[PDB]
Design a protein around this nucleic acid. Sequence first.
RNA 1: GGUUAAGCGACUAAGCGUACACGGUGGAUGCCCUGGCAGUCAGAGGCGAUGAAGGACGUGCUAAUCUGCGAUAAGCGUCGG
RNA 2: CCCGGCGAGGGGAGUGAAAAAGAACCUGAAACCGUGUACGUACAAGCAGUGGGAGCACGCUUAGGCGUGUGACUGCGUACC
RNA 3: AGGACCGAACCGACUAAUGUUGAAAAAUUAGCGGAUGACUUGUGGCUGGGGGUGAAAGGCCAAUCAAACCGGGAGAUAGCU
RNA 4: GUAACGGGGCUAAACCAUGCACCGAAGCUGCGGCAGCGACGCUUAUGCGUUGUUGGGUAGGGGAGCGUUCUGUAAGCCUGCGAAGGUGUGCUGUGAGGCAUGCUGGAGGUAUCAGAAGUGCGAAUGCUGACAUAAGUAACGAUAAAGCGGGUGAAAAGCCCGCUCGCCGGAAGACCAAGGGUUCCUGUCCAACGUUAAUCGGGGCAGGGUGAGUCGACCCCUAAGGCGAGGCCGAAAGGCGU
Lengths: 117, 120, 56, 17, 110
Amino acid sequence: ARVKRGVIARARHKKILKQAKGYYGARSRVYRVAFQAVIKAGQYAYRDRRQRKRQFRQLWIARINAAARQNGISYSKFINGLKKASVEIDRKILADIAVFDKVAFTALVEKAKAALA
Amino acid sequence: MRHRKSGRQLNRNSSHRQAMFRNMAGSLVRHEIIKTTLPKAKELRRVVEPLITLAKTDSVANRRLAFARTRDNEIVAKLFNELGPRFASRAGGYTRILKCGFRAGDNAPMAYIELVDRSE
Amino acid sequence: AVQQNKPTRSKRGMRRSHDALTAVTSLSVDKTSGEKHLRHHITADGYYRGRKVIAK
Amino acid sequence: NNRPVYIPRPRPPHPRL
Amino acid sequence: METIAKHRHARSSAQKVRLVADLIRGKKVSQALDILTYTNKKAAVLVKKVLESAIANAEHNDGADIDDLKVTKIFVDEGPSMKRIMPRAKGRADRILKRTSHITVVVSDR
RNA sequence: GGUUAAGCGACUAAGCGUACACGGUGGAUGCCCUGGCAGUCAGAGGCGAUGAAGGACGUGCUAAUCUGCGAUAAGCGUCGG
RNA sequence: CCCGGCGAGGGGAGUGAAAAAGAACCUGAAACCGUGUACGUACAAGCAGUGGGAGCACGCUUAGGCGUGUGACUGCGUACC
RNA sequence: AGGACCGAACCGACUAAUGUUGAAAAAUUAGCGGAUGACUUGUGGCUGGGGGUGAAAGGCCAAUCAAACCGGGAGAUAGCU
RNA sequence: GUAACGGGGCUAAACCAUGCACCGAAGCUGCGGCAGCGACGCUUAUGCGUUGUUGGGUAGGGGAGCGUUCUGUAAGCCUGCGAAGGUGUGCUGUGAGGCAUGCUGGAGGUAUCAGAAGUGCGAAUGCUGACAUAAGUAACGAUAAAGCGGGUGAAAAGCCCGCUCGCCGGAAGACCAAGGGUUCCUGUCCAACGUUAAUCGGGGCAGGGUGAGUCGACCCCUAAGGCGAGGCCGAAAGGCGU
């Protein structure tokens, strides 16, 4: 029983093309070349799903260091004071507080200094 | 480099170019008007105008030289008989060039070259 | 003496960008006949600088 | 739409021995 | 108002007629007419014929007063290509593509 | 409000990239086939010097091909449907 | 009927369920070639992607983002068998 | 008289240049050797594949020759890509 | 081309001893989601109030699944108030996929469970058709050479006529032999070809044109050579030859 595969091939090609839509040059026009992009795009997405956590941690650490140095204390000393005071707040909320409300960050820093000293 | 040199080549050798100029000058002076490409008329001025300059004067040797140039007994007869007196009072500028667009065959600059005459 | 890889339509269009022509934008109207003609050229009918030049 | 029937024999390689 | 006009199966190539089309793209009817008339291209007359057909269609089959008309949409497109075999050296055979182009002119008052 | 200075600073697209709408070359997919492939049921397994198969040339009102035919030439006669 | 070259083609009219069913004629996609729209791009280097990402253009309930296109800048990132 | 001498047609390609996806699947310009004999040519045949022919090079046998082309063994076999 | 800290740069931002803090992975921990393995309290062709553990992977081995043609189900169902294909969207499943719909289309398709594959393409210097690339680049096919005027025509350098310039002229002239089969002439057109246009052509359509006792073929004879009545030979075919 001869079976024609044109419909299935076209469906798969359209799926790949719609996945690859938005790329530059032939990467969004040629299926043979667009297929490589979608696999590479998936690999990049898989890597970035992990890289994003560490990059946001980097950004939050930088923001906390900036705020602490502006207030008159180093990031390491501030974190040590928080740990000695038994504060479980994380870098994300710490950075949000530092960015928006300065008085709250001043309270955090002074409590950390009191715990340290 | 062609610094100050004069004389177009027209994609032709010396013999072909001189024959072309001779024939074109003969036809131009025979018919009082011809149609030719603008470079051809520009290079043909320097040939035709001295013919009229020479024809201004009349003598046996002048007639012989005017025949040797343009190699046409009828043309030389027309010269010294009608081309002389009709321009005896004109010093230079015996020819006029009017651009008339481009040839359809190959899009070449076309222009009509004619004497300053024909005010009948 | 031959291409290692196929150039792209972007580069092709960039190269062809300079191939576009420029309009004359110099249509001159005859003083007498009031006809459009190329500057320093005789009109189609045979009128130049008002006076006739072709007599045909 | 016939495929080229005759193809010339390749140019002899340069001596690489 | 569309008042379309086209000349299919034109001998001139689209790549060489787009150059002429761009000159008149978006200009007034009279300006385009004179530009095409005094353009030194075969495509110039080829598209001037189409422009004349379009303006005649506007005059007759549609509203009069061609004075307030502009060439809004004009574009040149390739057409069917004819295969020709040209002998070459060493017995090699190459294929010559006699390219034809479709030219469309749309003229509207607004 | 004006003169001067410093800083900052959009508005440009010859062309190009992305997404959308509209066009064209192109005959892929979908549907149909008096076209093919393989079998079962039965016949027959030869044609021909009372000139075989296969062909040339002709054959209509018609310039040409297919089909049938042979100077009785898209044909004639007898008997049936 | 008109443009056009007593052409080709096209535009009107009519036939036709349908004429982007017009003989280059069923359904009519892709590589490829343009137009218009919105964005970005003429001091910025490399598998041209991913995460973040300000702004701009389109509609929404509510008046804040949400759906799509674009996306400067930034960390990482040397195609497939 | 000369398997003579110089030199046209004719035969061949010894040198240089151009041409190597060329005008041509070995060509064109000028030089170059024979040009009354072992010369050449038109026509018609004979010698057919481990065979023909070969002033003999492993040369030619329809642009293919240390064993032609066409169809069959045959979808030979490949421990190889 | 600095090039033997990565660079900037550092006299501590160089090396030894100690300490307290922090960054530091897909490693661990916290949460949620999925699948296999063994147990016990129970469900008993299956959930688990559970428990511990496993889940990188090539060749390879095992298990479970998605897609399409056709057959039974199926003369049942959807379908001209719109099937199949095409084209975008929103959901949905660890997935091959599935569902509905905006527009084209126009008359076929097919639920669930089973049966067979010519059953899934991204490569094999793969095959067929089309389109890009180079690129609007080379080239437009002996360096014997065109100009003017008039005519037709929409358009003239190449089409027709006239005057000039040039080439072959032991040929680039005229007859034939072999070889082609109407290309020869006229009228008519630029659909396709002429390496461009063409009104022109050895291009498209129609018509006309080939007159032999003295030309040649045909015919009589024949060389080389072929066929070959009988005849000789050879497994057959067939080879020689009067």
